[PDB]
Amino acid sequence: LDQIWDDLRAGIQQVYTRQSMAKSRYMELYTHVYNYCVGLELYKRLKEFLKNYLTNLLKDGEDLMDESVLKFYTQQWEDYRFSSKVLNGICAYLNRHWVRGIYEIYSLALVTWRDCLFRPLNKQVTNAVLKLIEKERNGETINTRLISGVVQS
Amino acid sequence: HEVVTLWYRAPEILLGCKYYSTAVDIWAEMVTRRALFPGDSEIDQLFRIFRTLGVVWPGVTSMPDYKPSFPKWMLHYDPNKRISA
Amino acid sequence: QIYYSDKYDDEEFEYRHVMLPKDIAKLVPKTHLMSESEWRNLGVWVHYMIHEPEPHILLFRRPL
Amino acid sequence: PSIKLQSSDGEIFEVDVEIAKQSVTIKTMLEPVPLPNVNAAILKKVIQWCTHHKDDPPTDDIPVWDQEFLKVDQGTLFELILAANYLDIKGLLDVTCKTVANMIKGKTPEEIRKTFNIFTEEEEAQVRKENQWC
Amino acid sequence: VSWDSLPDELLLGIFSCLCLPELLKVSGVCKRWYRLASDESLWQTLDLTGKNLHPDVTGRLLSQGVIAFRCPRSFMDQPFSPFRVQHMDLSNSVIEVSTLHGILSQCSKLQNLSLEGLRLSDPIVNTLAKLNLSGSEFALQTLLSSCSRLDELNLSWCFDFTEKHVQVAVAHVSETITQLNLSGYRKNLQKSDLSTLVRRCPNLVHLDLSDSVMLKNDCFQEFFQLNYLQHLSLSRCYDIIPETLLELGEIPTLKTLQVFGIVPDGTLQLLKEALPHLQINCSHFTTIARPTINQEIWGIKCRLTLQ
């Protein structure tokens, strides 16, 4: 039933935010995974939702250029990766099993992040990373996970 | 199915059809009383008949010894159309 | 051993039946037919095929 | 270690890591949850098969035990295959698929359709015409 | 107990363990089952030897997602989208020349087909050249360079090869050829061609080069240049040094004893003294570019084998 997704989208949405959760949610969404099958028009909706959420997240990334955009970008990327991992682990059956962006949820998230990173924020992130590297090489040392996150990304 | 005779072998046996009904009776083993009769090997015996006497046999391509690459050149060829003695 | 037969056919082709000893029949494989230079042990063109019910038959080919 | 699971009707069953290693959908769990799809009858049936079939190298080319093991009514086989598809099992899924394939070997269309409980007189003549090659 | 509520790919699991009688039997029950009969996954390897069907049926089969085909000695005489056929060899079944449009004209890509003893016209090779040909020269020359990746080329007993046709043997541009077998043109091959052919190919693991009669003095050691082409393959020779054939193979590495053929009595048994290090030849049989080798060749086992 298509009417279940509009009510169940909150379960996936709250995954992006880090807090407590109910153990039954995993089984609740896992049942709806195969209960959806109609049963094919789901990839486009998921792609649109991911794209709009990613654009909304990137929109609040302009007022920070250095020493603040790095922490924010790293933590948002960690949250996005965690949400993508949860989505892959909770629904990985009705994606490409029947015959055949890449259909895989992890690959879809990766390609969306790749083709969204082409925005001018890449230049400012690179400039921040370079200036942090020069500041570290000047003699002082600071935390390393901030740019390590984007490196692993 | 197995036939020890050579010059009077059952036509069904040479064609690969083990099961036949009253085929031997319909098919004079030696009437010529000479060496002109086609006494040959297992395949050469049928080759001699094919050379001598060239739709005609419905359902011919359904036997173990009925190949499709063969050349073109009370005795009855059809086993079903055989008159009893 | 070598066997001989009349080289007569209704069409323009020509064929002759040949036979080989049982000892040499082991080398001949039922899967793949022999070639021009393969059949040299007998000491006697290419091996075309064999007989359907019989296990030993050779015809050979003659090119124009 | 001992791991417990919650049945649909409300029963509690004991499972072991070795007994559940061959599974992949519950291996991630072991690495009580609501499972409405499965019931107590299939839970004991699956767990007893796993205990008797756990160690193996990594007639009808299948174990003789499976012949009398799967001799059940059509309804239970429907539940078993549905659970196997949901549990993404391999050993049980392959065995029941082979058993079904053998049972549909050389059977009249009338009995197959009635047993399955599921395109005639307009296309039967056509399909017959282009299938005599076999 | 309805069995029609299952997904299609659970049904594919059932259909993956069926043979042709039951597979074509089960087709005529429902439209769904009718479609799941024809999936590309089920039809991978299909092998029908000598079932004398017309090529319309096998065209219907090339329209149903099959990847491999091996069918010798069938009868297809009476007369589409390009198709994915990587593994298809041929032994010479009798086939009409005109009805190759429905078989080969569609597909020229992929590993290609392997003929033997088949008489055919130029346009078929023209579409093919976009690979055994046992039994015009421009089409063959184009096809030789058409598949640069492929290294094995076989041809023998050509019925339309002239003296000038053998000149193109050295013109073949291929620096990655590993195995080859050309012979039978004893009265047409030029002895000077092999001298340049050896230089053209950097190496040749297998090279029969039999049916030599003149046995020119230069050819005795001209071919032996590198250590990757050592062999002693020679047959049907009239003028040759007896019991002293080890001169050509001064530095042999592999075991090759293809010396049988038309030789005078008393020399075949004495030839063992000229190669005491090597063993005596046991059996002689060509095993190069074989369409099939008793059917598991190239890892293609036909689950849809008629027998």
Q: What is the dihedral of CA B69, B73, B78, B84, to 10 degrees?
A: -140
- Using the Cβ of B62 and the Cβ atoms of chain E, whether some distance falls under 8 Å is answered with no
CA distance E155 to A127: 65
- Residue E219 makes CB contacts below 8 A (sequence gap 6+) with E191, E194, E195, E212
Distance CA B17, CA B62 (A): 9
- Residues facing D12 on adjacent strands: D6
Task: Report, in this order, helix, strand and coil percent for chain E, each rounded to 5.
Answer: 25, 10, 65
Residue of D nearest to A30 (CA): D35
How far B32 CA sits from the closest chain E CA (Å)? 38
- Number of structural domains chain E divides into: 1
Sort out which chain E residues have CB atoms less than 8 A from D128's CB and list them: 28
CB E202 within 8 A of CB E225: no
Nearest residue on chain E to B66, alpha-carbon basis: E50
Q: What is the domain extent for residue D92?
A: 1-134
Of C8, C10, C17, the CB nearest to B72: C10
CB-based contacts of A137, cutoff 8 Å, min separation 6:
none
* CA C5 to chain centroid: 12
Task: Please name the residues in contact with E257: beta carbons below 8 A apart, sequence gap of 6 or more.
Answer: E232, E275, E278, E279, E280, E281
SS3 A68: coil
How many other C-beta atoms lie within 10 A of the C-beta of residue A147? 19
CB B41 within 8 A of CB C18: no
- Written as six digits, the tokens of E175 are 């620096």
Closest residue on chain C to B16 (Cα): C53
Using the structure block, give the residue that is written with the tokens 């070997």: D105
Strand E68-70 relative to strand E87-89, pairing: parallel
Would you call C32 and E290 a contact, using CB atoms and an 8 Å cutoff? yes
Phi, psi of E272 (to 5 degrees): -65, -30
Angular region, E43: left φ>0, alpha ψ -120 to 50, beta rest: beta
Question: Taking the CA atoms of chain A, what radius of gyration do you get in angstroms?
Answer: 18
Instruction: Write E223-229 long-range contacts (CB < 8 A, 24+).
Output: E223/E194, E223/E195, E223/E198, E224/E248, E224/E249, E224/E250, E225/E198, E225/E199, E226/E202, E227/E251, E227/E253, E228/E203, E228/E204, E229/E198, E229/E203, E229/E204, E229/E205
Task: Identify the residue whose tokens are 């089969």.
Answer: E61
Tokens of E243: 């019991």
Q: Which structural domain, as residue segments, surrounds residue E133?
A: 1-307
Comparing CA positions, the residue from E263, B42, E284 lying closest to residue C24 is E284
Q: What's the total number of domains in chain C?
A: 1
- Whole-angstrom distance between the N-terminal and C-terminal Cα of chain C? 27
Distances (CA, A) of E81 to E59, E62, E107, E114, E123: 11, 9, 8, 21, 19
Measured in angstroms, the resolution is 3.1
* Integer CA distances (angstroms), E163 to A121, E139, E194, in order: 72, 17, 14
Q: Which residues of B touch C49 (CB under 8 A)?
A: 69
Q: CB neighbours of A1 closer than 8 A, spacing ≥ 6?
A: A35, A36
Decide if C9 and B66 are in contact by the 8 Å CB cutoff: no
Q: DSSP 3-state assignment of A20?
A: coil
Task: Compute the distance between CA of residue B8 and CA of residue A104 in angstroms, rounded to an integer.
Answer: 74
How far apart are alpha carbons E9 and A99 in whole angstroms? 8
CA distance E104 to E122: 13
CA-CA-CA-CA dihedral for C36, C41, C42, C47, to nearest 10 = -20
Contacts of E207 (CB under 8 A, 6+ apart): E179, E180, E181, E223, E229, E231, E233
Q: Which residues contact E198 (CB under 8 A, 6 or more apart)?
A: E204, E222, E223, E225, E229
Q: What is the number of alpha carbons within 13 Å of residue B18 lying toward its C-beta?
A: 2
Interacting residues of D52 by C-beta distance below 8 A, sequence separation 6+:
D65
- Three-state SS for B65-82 is CCCCCCCCCCCCCCCCCC
- For CA atoms E202, E208, E213, E217, give the dihedral sign: positive
Give the residue among E26, E32, E42 at the shortest CA–CA distance from E7: E32
Rounded CA-CA distance A21/A9 in Å is: 15
Total domain count, chain D: 1
Structure tokens at D124: 């039967």
Exposed e or buried b for every residue in E120-134, given b needs 16+ CB within 10 A? eeeebbbebbebbbb
Residue in D80, D81, D92, D97 to test binding to E, most E beta-carbons within 10 Å: D97
Q: What is the C-alpha to C-alpha distance for residues E12 and E59, in angstroms, rounded to an integer?
A: 24
As a whole number of angstroms, the distance between CA B54 and CA E25 comes to 39
Residue whose C-alpha is closest to residue A124's, from A60, A62, A59, A55:
A62
Contact E7 D112 (CB under 8 A): no
C-alpha distance from residue A130 to each of A65, A136, B1, D83, E237 (Å) = 12, 10, 93, 55, 78
Query: Within 13 Å, how many C-alpha atoms sit on residue E305's CB side?
Result: 10
Handedness of CA A49, A52, A56, A61 (dihedral sign): positive
Report residue E126 as tokens. Answer: 């023209």
Q: CA E261, E264, E267, E268 torsion: positive or negative?
A: positive
Q: How far is A97 from chain E (nearest CA, A)?
A: 8
CB E255 within 8 A of CB E230: no
- For E75-120, the three-class secondary structure string (H helix, E strand, C coil) is EECCCCCCCCCCEEECCCCEECCHHHCCCCCCCCCCCCCCEECCCC
C9·B73 Cβ contact <8 A: yes
CB D113 within 8 A of CB E33: no
Structure tokens of D30? 């072991």
CA distance E44 to chain D (A): 17
Chain E residues with CB inside 8 Å of A37's CB?
7
Nearest to E55, CA basis, from E7, E106, E6, E1: E106
Residue of C9, C52, C54 to mutate for B, most B C-beta atoms under 10 A: C52
Q: Residue E304: in which H helix or E strand, if any?
A: strand E304-305
Which stretches of chain B are DSSP H helices?
11-14, 23-26, 44-53
- State which residues form the domain around C49: 1-64
Q: Do chains C and D touch (3 or more CB pairs under 8 A)?
A: no
Residue partners of A115: CB distance under 8 A and separation at least 6: none
How many other C-beta atoms are found inside a 10 Å radius of the C-beta of residue E212?
A: 20
Closest CA of chain E from D39, distance in Å: 17
Q: Is B52 on the interface with C (CB under 8 A)?
A: no
